[PDB]
Amino acid sequence: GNNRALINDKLASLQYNPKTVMVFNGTSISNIDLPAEERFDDSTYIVMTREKCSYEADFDIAVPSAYEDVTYPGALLVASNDLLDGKPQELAVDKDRVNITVDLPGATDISFKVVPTFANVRAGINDILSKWFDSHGGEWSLPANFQYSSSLVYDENELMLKFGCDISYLKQKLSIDFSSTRAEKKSVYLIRFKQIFYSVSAERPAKPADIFAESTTWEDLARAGISEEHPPLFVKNVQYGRQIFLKFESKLSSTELETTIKGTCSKDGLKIDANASAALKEKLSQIDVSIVVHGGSEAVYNGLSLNSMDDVQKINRIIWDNTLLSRTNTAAPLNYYTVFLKDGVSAGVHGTTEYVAEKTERYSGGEIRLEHSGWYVARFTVTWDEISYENGLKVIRHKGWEGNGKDRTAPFSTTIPLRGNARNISIKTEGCTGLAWEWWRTSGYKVGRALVPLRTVSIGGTTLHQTFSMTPAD
Amino acid sequence: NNRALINDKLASLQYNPKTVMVFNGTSISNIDLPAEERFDDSTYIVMTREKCSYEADFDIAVPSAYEDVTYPGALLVASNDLLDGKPQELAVDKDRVNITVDLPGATDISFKVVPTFANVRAGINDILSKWFDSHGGEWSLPANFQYSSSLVYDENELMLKFGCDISYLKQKLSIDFSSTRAEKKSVYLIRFKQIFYSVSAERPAKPADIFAESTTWEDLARAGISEEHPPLFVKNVQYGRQIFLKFESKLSSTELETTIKGTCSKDGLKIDANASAALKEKLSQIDVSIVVHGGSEAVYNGLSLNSMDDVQKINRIIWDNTLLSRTNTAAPLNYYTVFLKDGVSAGVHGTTEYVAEKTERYSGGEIRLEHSGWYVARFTVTWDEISYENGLKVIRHKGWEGNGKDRTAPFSTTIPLRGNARNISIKTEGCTGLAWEWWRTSGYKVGRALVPLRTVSIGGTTLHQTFSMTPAD
């Protein structure tokens, strides 16, 4: 009982700041040279603007695939930045008994006391699990009820921070490599469906040293890594369940990828249907789908397409599968929560990471049709502004139709084609009355109109009754 | 004999036409301009700045006080100072030119006299009293009408969009943009212009014909003539009336433009008597100045837009004297020049840089949660909160304090959010009492906008959970 009393004193005297001992490290971008850029796709004008952003959120710690046997409820760890990177460092010493509590929904919480070891905690969990589904028939079922998350992802750090997942696992299965992806002109959108089936918690002993066997000494802890820079931690809680990831990769722009997916996919699945779209499909055809399913079932799929109605229904089925939880069909560990052993303060961290958001806007070209059928001489004036980005400067050039002011007779009809960089259209029509005190009469003067696909201005009538109609009548 | 020699001096007087007069635009430094934010009260305001430039043809206005030297058939020394409203008179003695008055509907009636401010003015008005006498009409329609409007950043943007005389407007409207920008005021300008008639002059083929036989080449070098400063001929002058309306405000550029564009048109100002209280308080922050340049001049300061009598007064100023009459003198507006030697246009293209200021306003809002059903529910509300700090758009994920907590009916509460909240998601769950399916999701809405009021109502029973959201979407 003398060794524990030394561990308590050395623990209580171990001075460290809970907030700064582990720290998320995100991407930094350090450069303001993000000028707008432009191009044309025939009459279509495509402007791409870039903005530096950072995303801030509580960092959820995934249970790594390769360290499940070290992150079980009641495990001990040495705090280390390498825990945030998916490599938690076991604190391997002998321990005394701890209360482990399984929280299953609709059931009263059953607990059991054992020395926290992977084999002991696992057996205890699987026993309580046996009694629960050995009491719902053989072993039974849980319908899909998912938390939903979606986002474009710039790099591995935005991914980890928004989705709280094990990058290492997801890199294996979904084949995520952002150097290859940006080297091509590809963007990535990611959806996650997440369902927690049950949780398992562990109570930290009032006096912390009580977690150790009586034989363990302070000197064993220091040899394993413990110190003020690496205080000990206690796995307070692990969640178990099922997780589905959908990765959408495209050469389309970020903005067009996000818009296409946001309109065809949601928390309800994929509602993509036939007879109300046609260029949507040539977009969709450019989107490669990958899927990984983890917990319950285990599956990965690659090479699916959203044109096919039967790929869409295969996806929705994967998503809305009921899971038959049993001894032969387990749940996967998803996230775990650590507390500092010294006092029981959380070791959850905040994370920040910077990224470059790219916004693409497409502005379609258009036409102005002028038609004169009136019994008089008429002139048309058409002007507009043309937008250009030349280095980091929005250049605005006033322009004019070559025919402005010229006299026009009898049946006259022309089309003025405009590209998507034209704004601020002004149109004026005048008809010569033939009478000296009112020689030119203005039948229409529309300024500041927008470029629409087809604008038609018709004048007709006679010298003293001049008609004007514009379509659309903006 | 001086004609032989003056004519050959303009042999190949070395100058490029396009280079001898060049528009001097504003240039902006390329120091970074970061987004700026502030809050009024729960309303969130983001201000962004973009460096721009505007290019167009530069219409040269007739400067007040240089009308004596920019009449048709007058002679000028070329020079960057002309673009700035100080054209340099070339005062030598001149022969006779054919000057042609162009009245709308009239035959082009010409006369040949010695180019002089007094000569052409008398010659034009003599032609005017003749066209008026041969008409029972007191009034005729102008040859042309033009309506323009824009925000203005500095004097150069103003000169280029409007082809105005900067100096006349600076004095009459007391414009100064270094003071205006300091006080955080924005400026919207509108112009109405009527050209009643033009008055052109034909340039003789043998250019020297324009000088009396007594003037020599040395009388001209003494007037300032060079290769750097070739001679100009005022070929055509437009006469009429012009009015400027200057709208000045502590409102933002975006909001000033949007308010004026919606209450002004080529027909004048329209304010609906049934105006929203929001719209009326913005109009109450707009001060209106007016400069009228015609046969009569006038300047108005401190007009307002807050009553229909204020709007009437302004529309009456705009449309007063917009028809040519015997009693309603036209005034010179714009003038066009050729190089005396060969006759090509001395007209220049212009470019100027400015900083455009785009302001967006994001009102606050509430989410009301209501629970009426016969079961235990929990709500989950999250959003992102936007900030601009340094040059960084910062997005902080936030959650309602009450998330995940069991709620028993009746429950009601309100979550207030300010306008930097975006991307709202709301999840409502109900406990069925069945171990199979303990928790059932009854509504899950993500990526929603912050509206002034979003109501989420849940009711029903454990196995029939009802859900309504208003606005649905």
Numbering used by the authors:
A (entry chain A): 2 to 475
B (entry chain B): 3 to 475
What is written in the article reporting this PDB entry?
The study of the pore-forming mechanism of the cholesterol-dependent cytolysins (CDCs) has established paradigms that have served as a basis for understanding the mechanisms of a wide array of pore-forming proteins (1), including the membrane attack complex/perforin-like (MACPF) proteins (2) and the stonefish family of venom toxins (SNTX) (3). These proteins all exhibit an analogous protein fold to domain 3 (D3) of the CDCs, which forms the β-barrel pore. The disruption of this interface allows the formation of the membrane spanning β-barrel pore in all CDCs.
We further show that the CDC from the terrestrial bacterium D. propionicus (desulfolysin [DLY]), unlike PFO, exhibits a high level of pore-forming activity across a wide spectrum of temperatures. DLY was crystallized, and its structure was determined by multiple anomalous dispersion to a resolution of 2.3 Å. There are fewer than half as many D3-D1,2 interfacial water molecules identifiable in the crystal structure of DLY, compared to PFO (15 and 37, respectively), which can be attributed, in part, to the greater number of bulky nonpolar residues that result in a more tightly packed interface that excludes solvent. In DLY, 49% of the interfacial residues are nonpolar compared to 38% in PFO, and to a large extent, the nonpolar residues in PFO are not in complementary interactions (i.e., hydrophobic-hydrophobic), whereas they are in DLY. Consequently, there is a greatly reduced number of hydrogen bonding interactions present across the interface, with 12 protein-to-protein H-bonds in PFO compared to only 6 in DLY. Interestingly, the analogous loop in native DLY (S66 to P74) adopts a conformation similar to that observed in PFON197W where it does not contact the glycine pair analogue (G296, G297) in DLY. One significant difference in the D3-D1,2 interface with that of PFO is the presence of a strong nonpolar interaction between the side chain of L162 in αHB1 (which refolds into transmembrane β-hairpin 1) and a hydrophobic core of D2 residues consisting of F25, Y56, A58, and F60.
